[PDB]
A paper describes a structure:
In xKCNQ1-CaM-ML277 samples, ML277 was included at 100 μM to ensure full saturation of its potential binding site(s). We obtained cryo-EM structures for xKCNQ1-CaM at 3.8 Å and for xKCNQ1-CaM-ML277 at 3.9 Å, both with C4 symmetry imposed. ML277 binds in a hydrophobic pocket of the TM region formed by the S4-S5 linker helix, the TM spanning S5 and S6 helices from one protomer and the S5′ and S6′ helices from an adjacent protomer. The ML277 binding pocket is lined by residues Trp238, Leu241, and Val245 in the S4-S5 linker; Leu252, Thr255, and Leu256 in helix S5; Pro333 and Leu337 in helix S6 from one protomer and residues Ile258′, Leu261′, Gly262′ and Phe265′ in helix S5′ and Phe322′, Val324′, Phe325′, Ala326′, Ser328′ and Phe329′ in helix S6′ from the neighboring protomer. The binding of ML277 does not trigger major structural changes in comparison to our own and a previously published unbound apo structure, with the pore remaining closed. The xKCNQ1-CaM-ML277 structure shows a similar decoupled TM configuration but a differently twisted C-terminal coiled-coil domain. The native structure which was determined in this work is shown in light blue. This twist was also observed for the xKCNQ1-CaM-ML277 data set 2. b The twist of the CTD in the ML277-bound xKCNQ1-CaM (light green) compared to our and previously studied native structures (blue and brown, respectively) shows a displacement of the backbone by ~1 Å at the top of the CTD (Asp526) and due to the propagated twist up to ~3 Å around the last modeled residue, Leu556. There are also local changes in residues that line the binding site. This includes a significant conformational displacement of the side chain of Leu256 to allow ML277 to bind, which would otherwise be hindered sterically. There is also a possible rotation of the phenyl ring of Phe265′, which was modeled in a position to allow space for the 4-methylphenyl group of ML277. All residues that line the binding pocket for ML277 are conserved between xKCNQ1 and human KCNQ1, but several residues are not conserved in other KCNQ isoforms, which likely determine the specificity of ML277 for KCNQ1.
The KCNQ1 ion channel plays critical physiological roles in electrical excitability and K+ recycling in organs including the heart, brain, and gut. CaM co-purifies with the C-terminus of KCNQ115, it has complex effects on channel kinetics, and is a required accessory protein in the complex where it is needed for trafficking to the plasmalemma, folding, and tetramerization. Here, we report cryogenic electron microscopic (cryo-EM) structures of Xenopus KCNQ1 bound to Ca2+/Calmodulin, with and without the KCNQ1 channel activator, ML277. We utilized a biochemically stable form of Xenopus KCNQ1 (xKCNQ1, residues 67–610), bound to Ca2+/CaM4 to perform cryo-EM studies in the absence and presence of ML277 (xKCNQ1-CaM and xKCNQ1-CaM-ML277, respectively).
Numbering used by the authors:
A (entry chain G), C (entry chain E), E (entry chain C), F (entry chain A): 95 to 206, 215 to 384, 497 to 556
B (entry chain H), D (entry chain F), G (entry chain D), H (entry chain B): 10 to 146
């Protein structure tokens, strides 16, 4: 049980203990990154190299110990059993990231001491806090849900960028600015300007000079800034709708009977293959039994899917149609019984 | 192929070439399951490929074509067992599994519960690895 | 059947074969565009002209062959039959784009070799990947759905731009900057600055200098940047709602009976015109029959439209009202029968 | 014009100047179609211009005014045939068309099915071009 | 009838005739504005003054005639009758705008000829196309619906701007840039920079120089750009939801019975005041009658409001509860009748 | 009653009197802030110091009187009774802000007179208008509702910023610009540029010079501007959905019976503890009574929560299932009674 | 004030101090309107201030307090007449008004229709200005 | 602990080890409350931890475990009293409280109303501080 408790405390935070542990680790990583920035500053390197090295040694030892204990505790779940299960757990990208960071830091500190590794490893280790993927998983789910509109937006934006950049390049190909430098010397420079304008940054290093270029830039800016800022709005509305449906979902006590029925039907279908078994409690009759069990499995799977998915107007109308048909059938039975009596 | 026609005709019992809700209910009553009209309608909807309202032989053939070993089906069974599984781990007590199978949802009897626990807990332990159980299935 | 298979593989991709074919074609087009950019760079033209010419010849031959085979395979669908059907297919904008690109490339390479055609044709041929219009069609549908609010936003933004630009032009008409150049020399320059500010680019070439101009620019920026960035949010929310309703739509097995009923009613109405026909199986009676068939056609069309459209609360309430009226009528019948009996 | 009053009065049978659900149902029963109250209500809703609940002579005139040859109606028929049409092409087998017409949705008999296939497949082939069929309609 | 037709053609466009008329008028106004811009350009004034004057005379005559005919045709509707009705119509802001433009143009051309009127009048007359207010009305409705969140956003943004601008002013109060000019010479300049940054323009004329200023600017930018761009997203989502509910609204044939009932109940309540009237067809009894008529009026008003408003889940549940109560009451009546019989 | 009226007029505005009072106070504060800006301007200090001092004295006296009267009137509500209740009211952040502003202004004017207090106190006192927290409370509620997606967006944006800034720093570490200054002299400067670009400001002081840097900046800008502008869209959609659900909420007359039932059940549960009480009107029986009362309390609490929460499809389906079960049970009872009779 | 108690007690007829759906229905039946349970429930909901389910004397007092001449009520009547008004103008034919009043929605008789048209079309013309009619109301 | 089994068995009356809707309704009828099937179903749903449809002894134990003094419960009672409280203040008249308790929602009798007002208005004043009342609870 201690293995499960430590695995929960190290990978699936639930209490303020795990919260403060992760917060302290992230704060230490951020402090090390800030000291790396100070070292990269040309005037603050000699007074920071020693403390950077010491903090790097302490942090690499700490992360090695953390990775070892996490590997030991990963065996709590049944999916990770033995050497093969531990390898399967380590194959996960986050574990791969941690292993790569650990080995790179160890080899860098063994070699060392001016090197870019002591900084790029901090850059990559700032990513270690994304445990369980509770952020990247959500982002990927939303992007995959909206992939069609996202691709449409990207394609329209890129095509508009290319066309307008070429038009502006044709407009101001020979427009010498005040500083005696060609603002648009080549289609590459024009494309850089187009990217800047569509991204709505406006560095100002390259600005159109001729009136044709100014007019084209204005029209294309007004008609393409919306498209190149569209993904922000799309993802925002997607996130809002997703959280609304999440707060509209049914409670977890409405899935238990459906899961039970699904498991029972699956077990019945599995046992139908074996001729001598206890499942034969209510040749051709055996085939009918297995077909009926398959149908029960399918209907149980559909019911479980509908129960898991948040309630919908289609579910409401289906349920009402079922109830209305039941009531109509029973009323017809009462009517025919009354007709028989009289 | 040949058995599909015999099985389809077995539910027919009238030679009309089409299976309906009343026909399936009569077959179920003869078998001895005592179903309800809601269950009959749900089954007909789930097996009805086109959705006209009845069951045809091509629809029965398609239903036979779709079967187990699907990755989606295995994932569904896995997450259902996970929902039944407390502590977020992959292990559930044999007593808890027996209780939930015999009470919650569909009802099961002693012999089938014993067969289920025998097939699940292959080793002499009080826990069952549902991942390996599904993989064995 | 081979004609249909090749048409599907060339215009309606369904498998990884078609996916990789289109990906390779798009990648080749992008590589040719990048080499055209390198050629347009003044220092990388002599070493790139020959490879650009060779790649252009290869690509024009490939696209000519692709267009020929697509024209041959377009006859699979019944809409394109014979010479007239092939012409109708070629009249489609994408086919027109491909034909124009092919003929322009052929004539350019026959004339050639410094020319802007070898680059503008690549710019236009980057658009060839938009097969079936699965992107432009969606964009046009959403824009046409939101046309009223989009026009409102465009009009408000343009009017605010014009008014604020004129006010700033009046404010800083005679404000000489540090570089001894009139920042706002004319209403044209002031309008260019206004466009830059409303589009939220901020090139910085033209910046107000007097405090009145600064105050007006600040107030108008705060009160008009939202309006000139509004279309991004509008289109994003529209895309999100459209994809939500798309994922909420009913399955395709709920449209078949409605389509069958619509076709049957249409055929009955068509056959009602012919006096001697098999449709006369259950003068004035003929008129009543044709009127009833017309009513059946109308109700079938409405039912099909409702079935195709995603389920709605109005559909739910209509269906419940129908069922409740049925139940009330049958209960009234039972009540009157019981009263008659007793 | 004159026939509209006679047709409207034909459904009346009581001279009250207004058509109701019960009146239309009685007319349908006399014709021999055996309808239901839901169908009657749907028809009354579809022909009722104002939506009060009954059918008036101006509403009947408007219903007569709206007729076939509409571009929207042709598009609807075209996409319905496309939904019935597999492979995404414009051709469907005559046997499949016969089966779907005689079983799915509304029921049709042998003579009307034969007339439909004769009017659709003008040439001696196993496929029907629904685009040309609708254009002929 | 001709008066109504011309009023519809001039103020409520319905056909392509009115569409092309308004398009031509707007295009002429835009052409005049472009020529005014050319005249404002210092190098293109002598060749444009004469044509500007001639076009201004033609356009002022045309707009005077249009205003006269619109005033004559405004009497079609009952709201505008006689001199008082014409004055009430002219009191509308659009008519006021047209009258002001006409009189200002007439007086300017009578005085004239270098004047700013011949340009500001064009600027204001570009607004004349907003007939019926079908744009400003929608914008005002949405803003009034979202007023609470809009005020919250404005207040938070303004407070953040003020606080961060003061902090940056304290940070870089004495930071001389390379050009030997105080980037932040006063809190006014710091506030201008803050407005630029929150509006996400980035002119670059004023940029922080000290590291404290850079850090504060970065943090405040990341934490306040979202708030100062919030109104765009709010209004976009509001427009999208409004158009979705507009397309979800019930047909116009479901409001007629409710309007009829409301009018009848209002007339009954009005006639209840008169003692001798035909409304007395089914002292204390009169008071009961008038109270019942008042209750009928209230319930009819509520029913009309619910019918006009788009269908809602609360309407669905209310209607189902009513139907269920009716069915329960009738079943109870049948049960008691059966108990009495047996 | 006068105490309650003055408390309402001073803290919970309801009428035009309170509206104009708050508007006048806010306008006076804004005027004082503008005069402070003029004083901070180096050329407009001597002519503004005296009026700033006089206005500060008047405003501090007015705010002291307002705070005293608000403290006196805070005793109307039962939550604030006696010295402890007044202290509890003063512990509220807005009261703390007012007290801090008052004491700081008094001490500053007693010390004075060049000081930054006479300006920072105005900056902080511009916040005093946010009475009742009707803005910050809404903002905090929405942020707490969307916390998961907001944290995801912040983390993804920060990680992308760090990685891309490091890549650009590696690209253009030794790229001397035209002005002979290192555009990217250190990772700190590169990170400042990255923050500017992701926030989409584009000051232009630091711009990439090498083509590798330009390409990396373009790609990262296109792929990260959406993420760093995401919170605007998220909060906008959240505000729109919140106001839609607010306008969809049920009337306040549907909560009264639920509140009554909750209070009655709570009182019954409380009185069940006392053995001798009037609640014993319909040992082991006492335990059954208290268990039943606890169940009634729980069901009443759930019903009140559902009634307070806006109507939902899950509520609709639950209510329909309850009604259908009731109807089925009663029909079964009628059927069994009829079978018994016959 | 005094008449309110008498009017409230008039609907009572049992001295319990509270008005219920059954009581109001019995009063309506005695008057001779022949109402329905749905109408009774809607009226009780519309007059029930708190929403408990019955009608109290304070609620009756509040209902009496809220009355006509409200700007919202006038606007509602105006837009209802506009919906009845074709051509978007402010004029409707007297014959069309008579037809809609006598057929659509609530039913009216000849005498009340004549009074309505007399009060609306004060001048001898075939059109009625509903704006002025409402203002007169 | 021991009393929980006795209380759970008290509702049983049949020794089956499970409590159902019919069993609880029979217990309530024996007590003399005269409940309805909707109330029974709502109570079973509110006490049913898993949601299978019946009440188990572990579910009864959990229901006993969850009890009063919860901050959420106190907040709910406070805001309910605030909703009952006009003027936005914390004081309500004793007469108004008596009227609402005896009429609106659940019905109460004179003795229990007197006990409630005695426990609420400890001091001889016409107002009750519901905050202090809840704190005393
Ligand atoms: C506030 O003022 C407004 C008002 C309306 C909009 C708006 C929304 S959608 C939309 N359609 C567009 O922007 C589409 C379609 C209409 C023409 C312009 N394009 S293109 O540039 O993408 C483009 C560029 C280059 C190439 C080769 C193809 C396509 N225009 C934006 C801002
Ligand atoms: C975060 O801080 C905020 C708070 C609120 C908003 C906001 C939303 S909607 C709105 N109404 C507006 O922006 C409208 C209506 C109010 C006055 C300003 N205009 S005008 O410029 O278009 C404009 C400009 C020129 C002319 C000739 C006509 C109209 N103002 C924006 C940002
Ligand atoms: C992508 O990275 C992100 C992640 C999260 C957000 C985000 C959303 S809401 C929010 N709360 C805010 O921005 C609030 C509340 C938290 C502290 C900062 N403010 S304050 O500046 O307005 C502000 C400034 C000055 C004064 C005197 C008062 C208040 N921060 C934005 C971008
Ligand atoms: Ca059959
Ligand atoms: Ca079928
Ligand atoms: Ca096991
Ligand atoms: Ca009739
Ligand atoms: Ca009608
Ligand atoms: Ca054919
Ligand atoms: Ca009563
Ligand atoms: Ca009441
Ligand atoms: Ca009149
Ligand atoms: Ca039991
Ligand atoms: Ca249970
Ligand atoms: Ca008290």
């Amino acid at each position: 049980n201690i293995q499960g408790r430590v695995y929960n405390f190290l990978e699936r935070p639930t209490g303020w203990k795990c919260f403060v542990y992760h917060f302290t680790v992230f704060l230490i990583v951020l402090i090390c990154l800030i000291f790396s920035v100070l070292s990269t500053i040309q005037q603050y390197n000699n007074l920071a190299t020693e403390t950077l090295f010491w903090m790097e040694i302490v942090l690499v030892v700490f992360f090695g110990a953390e990775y070892v204990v996490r590997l030991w505790s990963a065996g709590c779940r049944s999916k990770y059993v033995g050497v093969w299960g531990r390898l399967r757990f380590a194959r996960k990208p986050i574990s791969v990231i941690d292993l790569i960071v650990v080995v790179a830091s160890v080899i860098v500190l063994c070699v060392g001491s001016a090197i870019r590794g002591i900084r790029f490893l901090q850059i990559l280790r700032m990513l270690h806090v994304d445990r369980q993927g509770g952020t990247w998983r959500l982002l990927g789910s939303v992007v995959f849900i909206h992939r069609q509109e996202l691709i449409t937006t990207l394609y329209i934006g890129f095509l508009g960028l290319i066309f307008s950049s070429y038009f502006v390049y044709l407009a101001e190909k020979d427009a010498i600015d005040s500083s005696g430098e060609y603002q648009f010397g080549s289609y590459a420079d024009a494309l850089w300007w187009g990217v800047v304008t569509v991204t709505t940054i406006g560095y100002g290093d390259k600005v159109p000079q001729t009136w044709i270029g100014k007019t084209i830039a204005s029209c294309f800016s007004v008609f393409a800034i919306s498209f190149f800022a569209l993904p922000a709005g799309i993802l925002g509305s997607g996130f809002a709708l997703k959280v609304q449906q999440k707060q509209r979902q049914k409670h977890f006590n409405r899935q238990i009977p459906a899961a039970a029925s699904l498991i029972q039907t699956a077990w019945r279908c599995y046992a139908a293959e074996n001729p001598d078994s206890a499942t034969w409690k209510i040749e051709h009759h055996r085939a009918a039994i297995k077909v009926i069990r398959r149908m029960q499995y399918f209907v149980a799977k559909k019911k479980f899917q509908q129960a898991r998915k948040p309630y919908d107007v289609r579910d409401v109308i289906e349920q009402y149609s079922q109830g209305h048909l039941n009531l109509m059938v029973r009323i017809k039975e009462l009517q025919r019984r009354l007709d028989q009596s009289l | 192929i040949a058995e599909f026609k015999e099985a389809f005709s077995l539910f027919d019992k009238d030679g009309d070439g089409t299976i309906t809700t009343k026909e399936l209910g009569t077959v179920m009553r003869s078998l001895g399951q005592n179903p309800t009209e809601a269950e009959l309608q749900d089954m007909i909807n789930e097996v009805d490929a086109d959705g006209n309202g009845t069951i045809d032989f091509p629809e029965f053939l398609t239903m036979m074509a779709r079967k187990m070993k699907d990755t989606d089906s295995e994932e569904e069974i896995r997450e259902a067992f996970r929902v039944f599984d407390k502590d977020g781990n992959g292990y559930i007590s044999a007593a808890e599994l027996r209780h939930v199978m015999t009470n919650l949802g569909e009802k099961l009897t002693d012999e089938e519960v014993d067969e289920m626990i025998r097939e699940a807990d292959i080793d002499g332990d009080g826990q069952v690895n549902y991942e390996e159980f599904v993989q064995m299935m």
